[PDB]
C-alpha cells in the first residue's frame, strides 16, 4: 500500500505549509461579529407578537 | 337521606375519575392514532354520562319527599340511566370483540380496520343503547298501571322488562365474553410454552406462568359480578309474589351495578402503559399550573 | 486524534509465550470496549478477543480458549494480551481495535477492511527457528 | 523498507503540525469571553405541528423565502409544506422508500433527494403541465447518499457512504469533480456563504475543508473521539461546528486551524444528530438521541435552553434564513416549528 | 384582500386533494409487511431469494398477504450507519451457512454479527428469523469425520442433544447433535436480552421452494400475535 502512503505524505506536506493566526485574534473576530449582529437576531432578542409570522 | 349522600358521592367520584381519563385519551389520540383508544374514549364518555344521569336523581331523594313527580318526567328520568348503563356494557363488549379480532385474525385485522369502521360501530352502539332505554316506554306490559306520584324504578317499569333483557342481552353476551377470553388464554398458553422451551435451550448453552390466568380472571370477575346479583334477584322476584325484594333491588344491588362504572376506568384505562404515562404527565401540569 | 500503537511480538518457537501491548491516546480509554483481532497470511481479518469497559466481561474465540488472556489497565491507558502455548497456526499480524462508540454494548465493524479505529498491528511468527 | 520510512515521515509531519498549532494557541475563547454578559434564559415554544408523514422522517430543508419547507420520510414521501397556515403544497412519491437526505434549491424551482439506492434524484416543481416529475437521476456513487446541497440550478454537491464527495453538472448528469481523502462514511456537508468552499464530516472522526473549483483538500481538523454526524458553518464563514457520537459538540476556526471550544455536560451520554447556528451566531442548537434539543451559548459554552417536545429520536434541525423560527424533525413522524 | 381569499381557497382545495391521496396511501402502507434479508458471502441468501443498485426488492404474496423483502446490494461492509434504517421492519431474516465452521471461522463471525444486531439500541424491538442453511453439507462433513467441530468450539465435547429434539428421518444422531449445538449457540445470545420485546425464530433449511415462504408467513403471524398479547398483559 505504498502508493497510498505516498498520497498521505503529500497531503501532509501540503497541509503543513499554511500560515496560522493567533487564537486570540480569531476569538476576538468571532466576538466582534456576534456583537455587531445582536439586534438583528429574532431568537436572541424576542420581538413583539405583531411582527411574529407564527403568532 | 343516606341514599342521597351515597348517590352524590358515587356520582362525583365517577364523573371526576372518568373525565380525567377522557381528557388523557383525547390528548393521546391527538398525538397517536388508534381505534382501541377511540373505544376507550367512548367507554369513558359513557361512564361520565352515567355519572351525570345518576346526579340527576338527587333532589327528590334528598330533600323533596313532598313534591310528587309527574309521569312524563319520571319515565324519562328512569329511562336515561338505563340507556347510559347499556351503553357502557355494549362498549365493553365491543372492546372485547376488537381485542379478539386483533389476536385471532392479525393480517385481516390489519387489512380491514379503519376509523370509519370504528365510528360506524360507535354510532350503532349509541343508537342501540338509547333504543334499549327508551323503546319500552311505548311498549305496553312493560309499565305499571297503578301510581306514578312516588317516582322510583319498578314504580313505572314492569319487572318483565329486566327479565327480557336478562334473557336477550346480558347472559348471552357474558357467555360470549367468557368464550373470547378463554380462546385468547389458550393461544397465550401455547406461546408461553414455546418461549419457555427456547429459554431452556439457551440456558443450557450459557452453562447454567399464570399472568394470563390472573388477567383473564380479573376481566371476567369485573364484567360478571357487577350486574349479576341485580338480574338474578329480579328473576327471583318475578318468580314469586315477594314484595320484600322491591326495596333491596332499588338500593343495594343497583349500587354494585353503578360501581361497575368505577371499576371500568382502572382496568381499561389505568392498566395501559401509554394512558398511565399520560396521566403522570398530566400530574405535573396541575402542580406547576 | 485517536491513536493506537501495538508493541511486542517477533519470532518464537512452538510452545513459547509472548506478550502484546497496546497504548491508546486521544480518547477516554475507560468508556470503550476493546478488542484484539488478527490477520493470517492470505486470509481475512478474524476476531480474537474482547474485554468490556471495567474488565468484568471477557470473551475469547474458540481456538484460543485456555491459552490467551486479555487484560486492561485504565490508569495507564493500556491493553495487554498474554499468549501461551503458541502454535504455527498463530502466525499473523495482530491489531488492537476500539469499539466505534462509547457507552454501548454492540460492536459492529471491528473486523471490516479499512476500519478507522484500529492500530497498525504487530507481527507474530511461530516457527522452529 | 520504504513503507516504514513513509510512516516515519508521516509521524514527523504530524508532530510538526501539532507543534505549529500549539505555537499559535496563545489564549482561549473562554478567557477572552470571560467579561461578556450571558444570554440568559431562552424559552422557545411550539407554534406549529405538521402532521401527515406515515413513518420516521430523516431530513428537511428550508426554502430561501423562509416560508416553504421540504421533508423526507421513509414511508416513501417527500412533502413540501407552507409553514404559514400549515397547508401541504406538494406530495411526491419516490421510487425507493429508503430516503436519507433532501435539499431545496435556492431558486425554489427544484428539490433533490437520495438514499440507499445510491442515486440523487432531481424533481422540477415549476413544470408547465401536470404535477411534479423527476427531471434527472445522478448515478455513479457506489454507496448510499447521506447529504446533498444545491450550488445553483445546474450544480449540486453530494456526499456518500463510499467515503467520497462529488460535484455534479445537472444537465449533462456527470460528475464534474470528485473529492477523496476520507477513510469512513461521509455523513454530512455544509456549504460556505460564498459557495467557494465546503466542509465535510465523516466516520473517521475528522472534518475536511474542500475548495470547490480546484477539487482539493485545504485543511483537516481532528479532535472528536467518534463518528461526526453533523456539521454547519458559522455565519461569517470563518468557523464551523461539529456534532459527534461522543456526545460533544465542537467549534473549529479556519484561520487558527484548530478547535476553539467544546460543548458538553456530564449528564449527556447520547450522540448528537444535528447542529445549526442562529442568525447572529450567538446560539448553537443541537439535536440529541435522548429525544431533546439543546440551545447552547456559542461564546461561553453554557446551556441556555431546551426544546423538549418530541417522543422519539430527533433526526434533523434547521433555522430559517431570516432567523425567525427553528424546525425540528423526529422519528415519531412529526415536524415541529419553534420560536 | 379578495385575491388573498382566492389564494387561501385554492391552497385549501389542494391540501384536501393531497390529504385524500395520503389516506389511500396510508391504507396501502399499513396493509403490506416489510422484511430485511441479511446473509453473508456464501450463506445461500440467493437461494432464499430464488425460492421467492444499492438495494434490491423482491415482492411476494401468501394467502392474499403482501410481503416486500429488501436485500443490500452495493454497500460497503461497514454497517453501523445504514442498518439503523431498518428499525421498523416486521422482521430481519438472518441467513447463516452452518456447514462452514472450519477467514476459516465463519460461524464465529456470524455469531458476532448476530450479537451486534441483537444488542443495538435502535433494534431493541425487531425480531429475527434465523435460517441455518446447508444442512446436507453439515451432515456430509459430520459423517466423514475429517474435520471436527471440536477445537473450534471446545464446549461441543460437553454438549448433549436436547430431549425435545425432533430429528429428520434417516439422520445419524451425530448430525442432529451438531445441528442443535449450532442452534443453541445463537439461542444463547438471543435468550439473554430482550425483556420479551423481540424474539428469534430458528429454522433448518436445505432446499425447498415453498416451505421457506410458509415459514416466514407463520413467523410473522406469531410476531404480530405476541405483540398484541403483550399489549393486553396476557404475556
Ligand atoms: C347486551 C345488552 C345489555 C345492556 N345492558 C345491560 N345491563 C343490565 C340491565 C340494565 C338495567 N338498568 C336498570 C335500572 O335500575 C335502577 C335504576 C334506578 C333506581 N333508583 C332508585 N332510586 N332512584 N333511582 C333503581 C334501579 C334496570 S335493567 C343495565 C345494564 N344488559 C344487557
mmCIF file of C-alpha atoms in Angstrom, chain E residues 41-134:
data_model
loop_
_atom_site.group_PDB
_atom_site.id
_atom_site.type_symbol
_atom_site.label_atom_id
_atom_site.label_comp_id
_atom_site.label_asym_id
_atom_site.label_seq_id
_atom_site.Cartn_x
_atom_site.Cartn_y
_atom_site.Cartn_z
ATOM 1 C CA UNK E 41 -20.750 -14.206 1.143
ATOM 2 C CA UNK E 42 -21.797 -17.842 0.699
ATOM 3 C CA UNK E 43 -24.596 -18.229 3.251
ATOM 4 C CA UNK E 44 -27.075 -19.067 0.484
ATOM 5 C CA UNK E 45 -29.297 -15.978 0.669
ATOM 6 C CA UNK E 46 -29.556 -16.052 -3.132
ATOM 7 C CA UNK E 47 -31.240 -19.466 -2.952
ATOM 8 C CA UNK E 48 -33.718 -17.997 -0.455
ATOM 9 C CA UNK E 49 -34.400 -15.206 -2.958
ATOM 10 C CA UNK E 50 -34.740 -17.734 -5.796
ATOM 11 C CA UNK E 51 -37.375 -19.705 -3.885
ATOM 12 C CA UNK E 52 -39.229 -16.375 -3.532
ATOM 13 C CA UNK E 53 -28.243 -0.696 -7.450
ATOM 14 C CA UNK E 54 -27.786 -0.045 -3.740
ATOM 15 C CA UNK E 55 -30.742 -2.214 -2.686
ATOM 16 C CA UNK E 56 -32.819 -4.967 -4.319
ATOM 17 C CA UNK E 57 -36.514 -5.648 -3.675
ATOM 18 C CA UNK E 58 -38.494 -8.889 -4.002
ATOM 19 C CA UNK E 59 -42.291 -8.879 -3.741
ATOM 20 C CA UNK E 60 -44.370 -11.933 -2.912
ATOM 21 C CA UNK E 61 -47.836 -12.831 -1.665
ATOM 22 C CA UNK E 62 -49.124 -15.576 0.640
ATOM 23 C CA UNK E 63 -52.857 -16.050 1.325
ATOM 24 C CA UNK E 64 -53.566 -12.620 -0.196
ATOM 25 C CA UNK E 65 -50.992 -11.046 2.163
ATOM 26 C CA UNK E 66 -48.277 -8.840 0.660
ATOM 27 C CA UNK E 67 -44.601 -9.030 1.657
ATOM 28 C CA UNK E 68 -41.750 -6.832 0.405
ATOM 29 C CA UNK E 69 -38.239 -8.133 1.118
ATOM 30 C CA UNK E 70 -35.161 -5.919 0.772
ATOM 31 C CA UNK E 71 -31.576 -7.107 0.378
ATOM 32 C CA UNK E 72 -28.476 -4.934 0.376
ATOM 33 C CA UNK E 73 -26.694 -4.561 -2.950
ATOM 34 C CA UNK E 74 -23.739 -2.216 -3.460
ATOM 35 C CA UNK E 75 -22.897 -1.151 0.085
ATOM 36 C CA UNK E 76 -19.582 -1.355 1.908
ATOM 37 C CA UNK E 77 -19.028 -3.968 4.611
ATOM 38 C CA UNK E 78 -19.367 -1.378 7.422
ATOM 39 C CA UNK E 79 -22.980 -1.469 8.583
ATOM 40 C CA UNK E 80 -23.260 0.620 11.753
ATOM 41 C CA UNK E 81 -24.872 3.591 9.960
ATOM 42 C CA UNK E 82 -27.255 2.170 7.340
ATOM 43 C CA UNK E 83 -28.568 -0.729 9.467
ATOM 44 C CA UNK E 84 -30.373 1.936 11.516
ATOM 45 C CA UNK E 85 -32.693 2.464 8.538
ATOM 46 C CA UNK E 86 -34.386 -0.883 9.299
ATOM 47 C CA UNK E 87 -35.719 -0.333 12.838
ATOM 48 C CA UNK E 88 -39.386 -0.534 11.727
ATOM 49 C CA UNK E 89 -39.406 -3.746 9.668
ATOM 50 C CA UNK E 90 -41.579 -6.642 10.776
ATOM 51 C CA UNK E 91 -38.569 -8.986 10.725
ATOM 52 C CA UNK E 92 -34.889 -9.370 9.928
ATOM 53 C CA UNK E 93 -34.173 -12.654 8.125
ATOM 54 C CA UNK E 94 -30.641 -13.748 9.056
ATOM 55 C CA UNK E 95 -29.167 -16.478 6.821
ATOM 56 C CA UNK E 96 -26.207 -18.486 8.161
ATOM 57 C CA UNK E 97 -24.163 -21.166 6.381
ATOM 58 C CA UNK E 98 -23.906 -23.714 9.192
ATOM 59 C CA UNK E 99 -21.506 -26.090 7.416
ATOM 60 C CA UNK E 100 -18.615 -23.588 7.399
ATOM 61 C CA UNK E 101 -17.436 -23.986 10.988
ATOM 62 C CA UNK E 102 -13.939 -24.934 9.779
ATOM 63 C CA UNK E 103 -11.376 -16.413 7.239
ATOM 64 C CA UNK E 104 -11.620 -20.119 8.192
ATOM 65 C CA UNK E 105 -14.092 -19.436 11.040
ATOM 66 C CA UNK E 106 -17.289 -18.044 9.529
ATOM 67 C CA UNK E 107 -19.626 -19.343 12.241
ATOM 68 C CA UNK E 108 -17.905 -17.181 14.860
ATOM 69 C CA UNK E 109 -18.191 -14.144 12.570
ATOM 70 C CA UNK E 110 -21.906 -14.826 12.099
ATOM 71 C CA UNK E 111 -22.290 -15.089 15.884
ATOM 72 C CA UNK E 112 -20.514 -11.742 16.387
ATOM 73 C CA UNK E 113 -22.724 -10.051 13.785
ATOM 74 C CA UNK E 114 -25.831 -11.593 15.361
ATOM 75 C CA UNK E 115 -24.777 -10.299 18.790
ATOM 76 C CA UNK E 116 -24.210 -6.803 17.383
ATOM 77 C CA UNK E 117 -27.636 -6.777 15.711
ATOM 78 C CA UNK E 118 -29.409 -8.178 18.778
ATOM 79 C CA UNK E 119 -27.878 -5.638 21.180
ATOM 80 C CA UNK E 120 -28.177 -2.488 19.033
ATOM 81 C CA UNK E 121 -30.091 0.266 20.836
ATOM 82 C CA UNK E 122 -32.217 1.103 17.768
ATOM 83 C CA UNK E 123 -33.136 -2.535 17.001
ATOM 84 C CA UNK E 124 -34.466 -3.261 20.506
ATOM 85 C CA UNK E 125 -37.939 -4.111 19.142
ATOM 86 C CA UNK E 126 -37.029 -6.016 15.953
ATOM 87 C CA UNK E 127 -37.458 -9.788 15.701
ATOM 88 C CA UNK E 128 -35.120 -12.131 13.823
ATOM 89 C CA UNK E 129 -35.956 -15.183 11.711
ATOM 90 C CA UNK E 130 -32.821 -17.340 11.661
ATOM 91 C CA UNK E 131 -32.232 -19.651 8.680
ATOM 92 C CA UNK E 132 -29.468 -22.210 9.294
ATOM 93 C CA UNK E 133 -28.767 -23.200 5.692
ATOM 94 C CA UNK E 134 -26.776 -26.048 4.093
#
